Design a protein around this ligand. Sequence first.
Ligand code: HEM
Length: 154
Amino acid sequence: MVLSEGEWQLVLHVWAKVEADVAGHGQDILIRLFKSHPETLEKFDRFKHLKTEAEMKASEDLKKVGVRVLTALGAILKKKGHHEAELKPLAQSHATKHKIPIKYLEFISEAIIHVLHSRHPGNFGADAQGAMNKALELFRKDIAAKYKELGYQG
Ligand code: HEM
């Protein structure tokens, strides 16, 4: 798939608002994930222990990870589709070290859209949301293809 410049602009425009507070958004997206799809939390040996949303909120470690998640995602989005190089090492670690199914990338996508929707209503109307969904869809499809090449495709 291919996004139009207009669609990229909508993505980048909300993203710029996310960038005003990476850590806070990182935290909101992960907690959202963990709450909606608790099975995802099992994938994190580091966080597995966290029982309640309050604990999750208090975890500096969880916060730290959210920043790394968003930072990486942000770098990919800014590439506007030319993200081969950035994807490689991400696909390698997620497929071979972390074993993260495409399904779970679907769930995080859903959490991202949910949080942007809540926090940036004015910059996240139907068009912007559609643009974001395409971008996240393109990410997922390219990562899936890499998984396959790497022997995981799952
Ligand atoms: C938007 C998609 C995601 C991006 C951009 C992303 C990015 C990252 C990055 C950059 C790191 C550090 C380097 C590395 O290990 O690759 C990381 C670690 C990790 N990620 Fe992803 N990831 C995403 C989705 C997920 C999902 C959905 C899960 C599981 C449900 C997952 C599980 C992990 C785990 C368990 C680690 C290592 C955590 C630790 O021991 O600190 N990630 N992730």
